[PDB]
Amino acid sequence: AQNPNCNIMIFHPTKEEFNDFDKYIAYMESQGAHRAGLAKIIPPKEWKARETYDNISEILIATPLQQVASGRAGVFTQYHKKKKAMTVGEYRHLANSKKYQTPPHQNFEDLERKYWKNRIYNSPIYGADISGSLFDENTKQWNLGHLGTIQDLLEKECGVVIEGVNTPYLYFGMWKTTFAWHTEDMDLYSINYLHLGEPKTWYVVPPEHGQRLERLARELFPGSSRGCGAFLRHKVALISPTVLKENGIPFNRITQEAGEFMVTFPYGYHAGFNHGFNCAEAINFATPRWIDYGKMASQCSCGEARVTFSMDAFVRILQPERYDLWKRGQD
C-alpha cells in the first residue's frame, strides 16, 4: 500500500503532466496521496493563473463575515456575523489596519503558536464564499472555472442525468480568518488555489481515521452533538493541534503559499487559518472513486447546514432513503 503513514504529499508536475487534470489526480492517488486527505500541487514554472492581480479591487464582498469565537483557546466554535458590503480594495485596507494585521513573528511556526494562543480573543472578517473566478479564460491548464462538472461525472458513472451546476468560489482572508473542521458536501473532493497574498495553514485527518475525529468532536461539543448527528456539517467547530495530539487523533499540517494548489480528498476532514490578506479560489469536483463516498456521506437534517441547489440531486440519486428527511432540513 502506497503512503501507509498517510503523509501529506507534494507534487511538482511538468507542463506536459499539467495538461490532463483527471489523469494527474489519478496519478497522485496511485502514489497514495489520498491517504493523507490533502495534497499540495506546485504548478510548473511556465504556468500562470492570469497575467496580473492589479485590477481586482473592485470585486464586491456583499456579505463579509465577522468570525466571533466562543469556548477555550484550543476548543471553540465560531459564528458568523454579517457585516455591511465592501469592495476587495476596502477589505484589503481593513486587513492591513493596525486592528487586523498580522503581528510580528519569526516564522510560520511562531505565527501558528500565536494563532492558537490568541485566536479566540479577536473577531477577524472573512470575505468567504463569493461566486466567481480569477482564472484568465485563456488559462487552459488547471483552470478551476473549466473543470468537468460533478453532474457530468455522476452521469458518466451511473447513467443518470441530473439538474445542477458546479461553479467556483472566491475567499478573501485576513490574519486569523478561520475555516472550521469539515469534509466537503457529499464528501466530494475540493481543489483550492491561493491566487495571491499571505499563506494559508491547513490541518487534515486521514480519511481512514475520520470517525476518530467525529468521536472526539462529540465529546468536546456535547450539546451540539445532541442537536445533530452530523454537526460538523455546520462548519463551526475548531479543535487545535495540541488537543488533537492529547487525544491521539491522527493528523497532519502544511502551509500553502501563493501560487500553489491544494486538493482535499473524499472524507478528508480539514481546518485552517489565513496568515494575512489573501485571496483563494476553490471548487468541488468528483472522480469515479468518489461515488462510494458520496453514497455513504453523512448528512445534517437539523436544518443548520443549509447548502446549494445542486446537492439535492446528489442526495436524491445516491442516498434515496435519506432524501425525505434531509430535504425537510433544507425546507
Ligand SMILES: O=C(O)CNC(=O)C(=O)O
Ligand atoms: O479556504 C478556505 O477558507 C476554506 N477552503 C476549503 O475548505 C477547501 O478549499 O476545501
Ligand SMILES: [Mg+2]
Ligand atoms: Mg475589480
Ligand code: NI
Ligand atoms: Ni473544504
Ligand SMILES: [Zn+2]
Ligand atoms: Zn445539523
